[PDB]
Design an enzyme around this catalytic site. Structure first.
Site, PDB file in Angstrom:
ATOM      1  N   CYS A  78       0.137   2.772  -4.436  1.00 33.65           N
ATOM      2  CA  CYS A  78      -0.578   3.993  -4.776  1.00 33.65           C
ATOM      3  C   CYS A  78       0.246   5.217  -4.408  1.00 33.65           C
ATOM      4  O   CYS A  78       1.144   5.147  -3.567  1.00 33.65           O
ATOM      5  CB  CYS A  78      -1.940   4.040  -4.088  1.00 33.65           C
ATOM      6  SG  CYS A  78      -2.997   2.627  -4.462  1.00 33.65           S
ATOM      7  N   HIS A 119       0.850  -1.181   0.000  1.00 36.55           N
ATOM      8  CA  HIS A 119       0.000   0.000   0.000  1.00 36.55           C
ATOM      9  C   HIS A 119       0.884   1.228   0.000  1.00 36.55           C
ATOM     10  O   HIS A 119       2.029   1.175   0.443  1.00 36.55           O
ATOM     11  CB  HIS A 119      -0.935   0.027   1.211  1.00 36.55           C
ATOM     12  CG  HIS A 119      -2.067  -0.945   1.122  1.00 36.55           C
ATOM     13  ND1 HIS A 119      -3.136  -0.761   0.273  1.00 36.55           N
ATOM     14  CD2 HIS A 119      -2.304  -2.102   1.782  1.00 36.55           C
ATOM     15  CE1 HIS A 119      -3.979  -1.768   0.407  1.00 36.55           C
ATOM     16  NE2 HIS A 119      -3.500  -2.595   1.318  1.00 36.55           N
TER      17      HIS A 119
END
Lengths: 4, 140, 93, 93, 139, 4
Positions: free
Chosen positions: E129, E87
Site C-alpha cells: 500500500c 505492508h
C-alpha cells in the site's frame, strides 16, 4: 544554467 | 485493443502554462528561457494535431480555475488531453506567480469520476519544474 | 464495467523526485527542448513511452552543465515518467 | 562522458501514491497475479513498458470487489509505473 | 535504442516475501503472499533470473540484502531485479519489525554506488500500500 | 479482499  | 482508439474528430486540447515572472514575495527568480520552451512546445504540439492554448504568468487561482474549467468542457469528440506546466516547483508542488499549489489538486480535476468525457482516454501532463534541491553529479 | 478514477493518466516530469531541473536562459530547459526535438522527429510514428524513453536518454547523455559554470559544475539530470496508462498511445490515425 | 546516478531505474508499483492495494488470501494480490500472467504469456516477446501497460489494463479492468465485501465493496485499483529507463527493455536475445 | 542483453546472465532477482509481522507493528498476516511469491519465482526464473526468496525480513535485514547485492559483481549480468511483497505506506515499506524507506533500499544501486550495473536496468516491483485512499471507480 |  539556472534551476527551476 | 492494445492501443488507445484515436478515431475522433480531433486529437484534443493542449494547455500550456508559461509561468515566467513571479511575485517577489515568493523568492523565486525570473525563469529566463521558458519562452523558448513555450514556443517550441506550441509549434510542436500544434503539429501533432492538438488545439493548443498558451497561458502566461498565471496565479495559482488562475491555474486551478483554468484546468477546472477545461475538465468541465465536452471532450466527447477528443481523443486525448495534454497539459504542459512550465514553472518553478518544489516536491509535489508547482509555483504560480502568487505562490505554490499541489500537482495533485491540478490534475485531480480530470479523474475519471470528475471528467467523464475523457473517460478511457489518455491524460498527459508534462512538467518542467524542480522537485527539490538535490543535485546529480554523474559517474564514469 | 467500472474504471479506476486515477487510471489513464501519464506524468512526464522533467526530473526525479527530490531533485533539481535545469533551464538555459539562452536556449530553454533541457527536458523540454529534448522533448520537442524528439517529438518533431518521431511524434507521428513512435509510441508515447518510446518517445519519452528516448527523451530520458537524450537529457541523460546529451546534457552536462560545463566546468567553467559556477554554482553548478558538470551536473546531470534524468527525467521521470509516471504511467498509469492502460493502452499503447500513438498520436496518429 | 557521464551519466546521472538516478538513471536506468524502473519502479513498478502495485498502486498509485496515496492509495491502497488489494490482496486475496486464496488466490493472491491483484497486481502480482496480473503481472505474472502477462509475463507468462509475453515476457520474452514484449518490451517492458508494453508488458507493464498491459498489466495496468488487467488490474484496471479485470478486478472488482463484489459489494458483498464487508469492508471495501466494489472498489477497483490502478497500478503505477515509474520509469527512469534510457532504452527499450526486452528480456531476450 | 535497446538495452544490450548480450551477457552470461540476465541477472540477480531478489524476492522479499514479508508475511508474518511483529505484533508491535499492529499489522495483520498477509495471507495470499505465498501464492504471489511462488508465482513470481517461476516467472522471473523463466525469464532467466537467478531468483532467491527471503521470508519475513527485518528492516535491517532488508537493508543488508540490497546493500550486499549492491556490492556484488554484476559485470556478467544484463540487469537487476528486486521484488518487494509487504505492508506499506507512502514511500515506506514494512519489515517484520517496522518501517524502512523505499529510497534507502534502492539508493544502493545508484550509478555512483554500483558501477557494475551502470547503464543497466534496475527493476523494482513493489506490491504494497501507498496510503489509505480508496478508488471507487466510475462507469 | 485485504489491503496492503
Amino acid at each position: 544554467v539556472e534551476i527551476x | 485493443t492494445y492501443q488507445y482508439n484515436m478515431n475522433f474528430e480531433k486529437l484534443g486540447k493542449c494547455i500550456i502554462i508559461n509561468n515566467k515572472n513571479f511575485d517577489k514575495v515568493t523568492g523565486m527568480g525570473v525563469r529566463n528561457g521558458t519562452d523558448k520552451d513555450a514556443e517550441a512546445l506550441f509549434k510542436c504540439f500544434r503539429s501533432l494535431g492538438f488545439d493548443v492554448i498558451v497561458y502566461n504568468d498565471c496565479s495559482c487561482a488562475k491555474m486551478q480555475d483554468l484546468l477546472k474549467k477545461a475538465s468541465e468542457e465536452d471532450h466527447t469528440n477528443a481523443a486525448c488531453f495534454a497539459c504542459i506546466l512550465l514553472s518553478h516547483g518544489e516536491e509535489n508542488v508547482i509555483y504560480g506567480k502568487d505562490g505554490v499549489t499541489p500537482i495533485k489538486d491540478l490534475t485531480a480535476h480530470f479523474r475519471g469520476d470528475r471528467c467523464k468525457t475523457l473517460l478511457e482516454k489518455p491524460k498527459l501532463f508534462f512538467i518542467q519544474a524542480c522537485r527539490g534541491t538535490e543535485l546529480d553529479d554523474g559517474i564514469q | 464495467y467500472k474504471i479506476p478514477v486515477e487510471a489513464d493518466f501519464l506524468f512526464a516530469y522533467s526530473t526525479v523526485p527530490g531533485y533539481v531541473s535545469y533551464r538555459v536562459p539562452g536556449r530553454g530547459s533541457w527536458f523540454v527542448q529534448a522533448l520537442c526535438s524528439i517529438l518533431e522527429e518521431h511524434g507521428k510514428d513512435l509510441e508515447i513511452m518510446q518517445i519519452l524513453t528516448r527523451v530520458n536518454d537524450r537529457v541523460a547523455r546529451h546534457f552536462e552543465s560545463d566546468s567553467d559554470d559556477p554554482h553548478f559544475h558538470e551536473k546531470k539530470q534524468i527525467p521521470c515518467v509516471v504511467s498509469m496508462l492502460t493502452k499503447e498511445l500513438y498520436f496518429s490515425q
